[PDB]
From Swiss-Prot:
This protein is an anticoagulant protein that acts as an indirect inhibitor of the thromboplastin-specific complex, which is involved in the blood coagulation cascade. Keywords: Acetylation, Annexin, Blood coagulation, Calcium, Calcium/phospholipid-binding, Hemostasis, Isopeptide bond, Phosphoprotein, Repeat, S-nitrosylation, Ubl conjugation. The keyword Ubl conjugation applies. Annexin repeats lie at residues 12-83, 84-155, 167-239, 243-314. A motif ([IL]-x-C-x-x-[DE] motif) lies at residues 311-317. The gene is Anxa5. This is Annexin A5. A pair of annexin repeats may form one binding site for calcium and phospholipid. The [IL]-x-C-x-x-[DE] motif is a proposed target motif for cysteine S-nitrosylation mediated by the iNOS-S100A8/A9 transnitrosylase complex. There is a cross-link at K26 (Glycyl lysine isopeptide (Lys-Gly) (interchain with G-Cter in SUMO2)).
Length: 318
């Protein structure tokens, strides 16, 4: 159903490509153009084979060489495209946690939009790489109900998608109604359990039924009922339950919409989704924000950075 914008290259010859990359870096200067035109046109799997060939041909590390030749945002963008798919989210997560500061925005974004299937892989990939337990790192860097919601999510235990049980839809909407609007204060525990564990098809029916019953969209109650990270988290979850692409098209938009740009978010969403559903993200960006993602990246970015990005995203009309 989903569609990314980067696919496997047809006449792939990892050895030929590595040679092109060597030339682009050998001697004085760099042919950034040759680099970017090549790398944004191979799938992540192919980029791993190229790095492999490069090492057996020249005994040099493709990524470490690039880190020496490139600079600024282009570098960061090229370094991210080189990260093996199975490892990127883990890498972004580890980096949001580590340090004297945590980027809850990153924690929220990845954990809420990734499916249980993806969360399990991410958890494995994370432990094998940093020799730490993701849950334990999140738990230690966060607190309150925000932390709880994240753990519930990390269990990747969401119920499966069965035929919808109306009595059950009714029950859950009423429960949410009683846990928030009809209450002085909030029963966050009830929101966490219903939002974090019920199936996706079930919750979509509950969101609607809840509108019917209360006159509010669950999003408005959340905003009325909560604050801080828990609010952002719950909104992210609700948004992703409705449509992950749509939720991501929106975090992309707010990354640029502001004055300058949140390049880390721009890089992270475009790269991480390039081979999953970036095409869908593009479509949702047009519908809801009037302009294609292309036109928007095009005006906020520049340099080879802008060229690579536009080449990865593509679609001038979306
Ligand atoms: Ca050089
Ligand atoms: Ca550098
Ligand atoms: Ca209340
Ligand atoms: Ca609020
Ligand atoms: Ca801007």
């Amino acid at each position: 159903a989903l569609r990314g914008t980067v696919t496997d290259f047809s006449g792939f010859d990892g050895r030929a490509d590595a040679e092109v990359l060597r030339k682009a870096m050998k001697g004085l200067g760099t042919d950034e153009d040759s680099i970017l035109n090549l790398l944004t046109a191979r799938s992540n799997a192919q980029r791993q084979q190229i790095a492999e060939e490069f090492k057996t041909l020249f005994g040099r590390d493709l990524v470490n060489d690039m880190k020496s030749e490139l600079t600024g945002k282009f570098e960061k963008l090229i370094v991210a495209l080189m990260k093996p798919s199975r490892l990127y989210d883990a890498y972004e997560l580890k980096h949001a946690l580590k340090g004297a500061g945590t980027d809850e925005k990153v924690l929220t974004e990845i954990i809420a939009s990734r499916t249980p299937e993806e969360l399990r892989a991410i958890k494995q990939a994370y432990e094998e790489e940093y020799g730490s337990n993701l849950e334990d790192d999140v738990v230690g860097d966060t607190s309150g109900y925000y932390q709880r919601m994240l753990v519930v999510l990390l269990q990747a235990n969401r119920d499966p998608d069965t035929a919808i049980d109306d009595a059950q839809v009714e029950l859950d909407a009423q429960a949410l109604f009683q846990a928030g609007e009809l209450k002085a204060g909030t029963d966050e525990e009830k929101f966490i359990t219903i939002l974090g564990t019920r199936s996706v098809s079930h919750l979509r029916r509950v969101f609607d039924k809840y509108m019917t019953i209360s006159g509010f969209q669950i999003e408005e109650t959340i905003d009325r009922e909560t604050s801080g990270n828990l609010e952002n988290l719950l909104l992210a979850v609700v948004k992703s339950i409705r449509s992950i692409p749509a939720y991501l098209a929106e975090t992309l938009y707010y990354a640029m919409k502001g004055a300058g740009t949140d390049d880390h978010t721009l890089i992270r969403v475009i790269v991480s989704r390039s081979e999953i559903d970036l095409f869908n993200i593009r479509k949702e960006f047009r519908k809801n924000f009037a302009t294609s993602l292309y036109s928007m990246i095009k005006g906020d970015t520049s340099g080879d950075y802008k060229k690579a990005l536009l080449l990865l995203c593509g679609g001038e009309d979306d």
